[PDB]
Symmetry: C3
Subunit: 89 residues, 3 copies
Amino acid sequence: SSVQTAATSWGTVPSIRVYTANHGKITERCWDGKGWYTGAFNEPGDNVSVTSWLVGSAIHIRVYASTGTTTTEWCWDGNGWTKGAYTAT
Amino acid sequence: SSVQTAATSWGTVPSIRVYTANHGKITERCWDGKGWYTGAFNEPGDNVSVTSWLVGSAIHIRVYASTGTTTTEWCWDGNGWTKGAYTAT
Amino acid sequence: SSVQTAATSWGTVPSIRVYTANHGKITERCWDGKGWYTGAFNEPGDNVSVTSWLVGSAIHIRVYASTGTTTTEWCWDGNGWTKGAYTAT
Ligand SMILES: OC[C@@]1(O)OC[C@@H](O)[C@@H](O)[C@@H]1O
Ligand SMILES: OC[C@@]1(O)OC[C@@H](O)[C@@H](O)[C@@H]1O
Ligand SMILES: OC[C@@]1(O)OC[C@@H](O)[C@@H](O)[C@@H]1O
Ligand SMILES: OC[C@@]1(O)OC[C@@H](O)[C@@H](O)[C@@H]1O
Ligand SMILES: OC[C@@]1(O)OC[C@@H](O)[C@@H](O)[C@@H]1O
Ligand SMILES: OC[C@@]1(O)OC[C@@H](O)[C@@H](O)[C@@H]1O
Ligand SMILES: [Zn+2]
Ligand SMILES: [Zn+2]
């Protein structure tokens, strides 16, 4: 079925991250001003949303991956992807 | 059917808002730096998107809730959710 | 099927762009503080996401339009929409 994307950007270059839910798997493509490349994020999901914010020049990213009625938060704080404290209720 | 989410964030703490369209109903979870709690937003929708912007330290949120071919805009400007002027045509 | 939207905003007025994927067609509605109107963007797609950034006072917008397993990026840089370099792999 048709894939589903979510996008975020930061700075003025800019950096862009595009997340794609594709048949149960979410992957990440990256732009930092000089070509698209595959990012490290790879987790299960039928649906994806994202938001990001800067603290100074350090980017923080939250990706929300949903399967069925279960949503899992993934956190990027500059040094690795980790599961977040988000709960749905 | 998997639920569908949309997310926005502001500031450096940050504040995060996650909207979940769950089989026709959109609810909202909130992070302001010290735990996830349920927000005031409760409206019908199969699909949801969001954007937000700061005027000084005041957050303004716009949520776009879609059912069928009807999209309703909901506005947070500090003191309650109100229907916005958005129309598709 | 219910339509699916993506929203972005910039400035303090603000300007808002809302993209709606509606049965294969993505269209755009615009707010610059003085009423909603229809924007130039009109391209095919079953799913849509968007991000934007400012460089000074100039807005740059990226719309990710997906049909099947194909995602096409559309770029606004002040002077018309053009296809972007985004690729999924
Ligand atoms: O520089 C690329 C990278 O480290 O940027 C932050 C996140 O997007 C990561 O998944 C990604 O691999
Ligand atoms: O740094 C991780 C974290 O504390 O960031 C704020 C929220 O995203 C939380 O759910 C998350 O666990
Ligand atoms: O402090 C929580 C709250 O008031 O923040 C602004 C909006 O997200 C509201 O729906 C939400 O209840
Ligand atoms: O104050 C509310 C409002 O004027 O804000 C800007 C746009 O979101 C409009 O649709 C909306 O009615
Ligand atoms: O002034 C309206 C407009 O030029 O703004 C930038 C883009 O949203 C365009 O599609 C749109 O027509
Ligand atoms: O100016 C257009 C462009 O170079 O902007 C940055 C990225 O969005 C690229 O995919 C895109 O082609
Ligand atoms: Zn279901
Ligand atoms: Zn339909």
